[PDB]
Amino acid sequence: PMNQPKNIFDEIYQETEKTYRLNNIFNKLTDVEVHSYQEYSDDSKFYPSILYKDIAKTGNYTKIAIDFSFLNKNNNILIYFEKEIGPNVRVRIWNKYTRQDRTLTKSVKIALEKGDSDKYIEDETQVRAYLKKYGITAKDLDAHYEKIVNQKVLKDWCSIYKSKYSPKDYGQVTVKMQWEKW
């Protein structure tokens, strides 16, 4: 009552924190696997991480995941996904909702595949050079975000939880997009 969700990301965060030790709400979503990974700050605890199953991934999308950080000072949900954009190169679109300032920050990174390993690139100038090389515009980034975050991840949430929000009306949330002027 005192701390009801103010937007769809609060709703996901709070219902997952309420259920992840008892019977994770995402057990209800058949397209994903639920994982438990060791918390860095408390050796006695695990955080939940959601990974879309291969059956549930489309076209060039290689990964779709939701990580929950409940224990740290900048606690948050992170929804991210990755798509191949050229030979040995993937774009990663990174959408982090920070609880303490009710802010969703959308950003773009690059992964370079060098055989076994990935090398990760986040510096804005380098990222934009890769995007320009492979012809990815800000409008393309919006379309990828709409397709995966709104039409898949958040639509999936609304299929397992009776949301007070929706993929087209997030609620009260400050949205900051790295590529807004690109």
Author numbering: 22 to 203
Excerpt from the publication:
In contrast to cells expressing TipC1, we found that TipC2 expression could not prevent toxicity caused by constitutive expression of the TelC toxin domain (TelCtox) targeted to the inner wall zone of SiB196 (ss-TelCtox). Crystallization efforts failed to yield diffraction quality crystals of TipC1ΔTMD or TelC–TipC1ΔTMD complex; however, TipC2ΔTMD readily crystallized in the space group C2, and we were able to determine its X-ray crystal structure to 1.8-Å resolution using selenium-incorporated protein and the selenium single wavelength anomalous dispersion technique. The resulting electron density maps allowed for complete model building of TipC2ΔTMD (residues 23–203) and a vector-encoded proline residue derived from the linker region connecting a his6-tag to the N-terminus of TipC2ΔTMD. TipC2ΔTMD adopts a mixed α/β fold consisting of three α-helices and seven β-strands that fold together to give the protein a distinct crescent-shaped appearance. This shape is characterized by a concave surface formed by a seven-stranded β-sheet and a convex surface generated by the positions of three α-helices. Using the DALI webserver to compare our structure with all deposited structures in the PDB, we determined that TipC2ΔTMD does not bear strong resemblance to proteins of known structure. The resulting TipC1ΔTMD model (residues 23–204) had a template modeling score of 0.65, indicating that the probability that our TipC1ΔTMD model has the same overall topology and fold as TipC2ΔTMD is greater than 95%. We next mapped the amino acids that vary between TipC1 and TipC2 onto the surface of the TipC1ΔTMD model, restricting our selection to amino acid R-groups with differing polarity. This analysis revealed that the majority of conserved residues are found on the convex surface, while the variable residues were predominantly found on the concave surface.
In addition to the WXG100 protein EsxA, we demonstrated that the T7SS of S. intermedius exports three effector proteins named TelA, TelB and TelC. While the mode of action of TelA is unknown, biochemical characterization of TelB demonstrated that it exerts toxicity by degrading the electron carrying dinucleotide NAD+, whereas TelC functions as a phosphatase that cleaves peptidoglycan precursor lipid II. We have shown that TipC1 is a membrane protein with a soluble domain that localizes to the inner wall zone and is responsible for its TelC-inhibitory activity. SiB196 possesses one such tipC paralogous gene (SIR_1486), which encodes a protein with 58% identity to TipC.
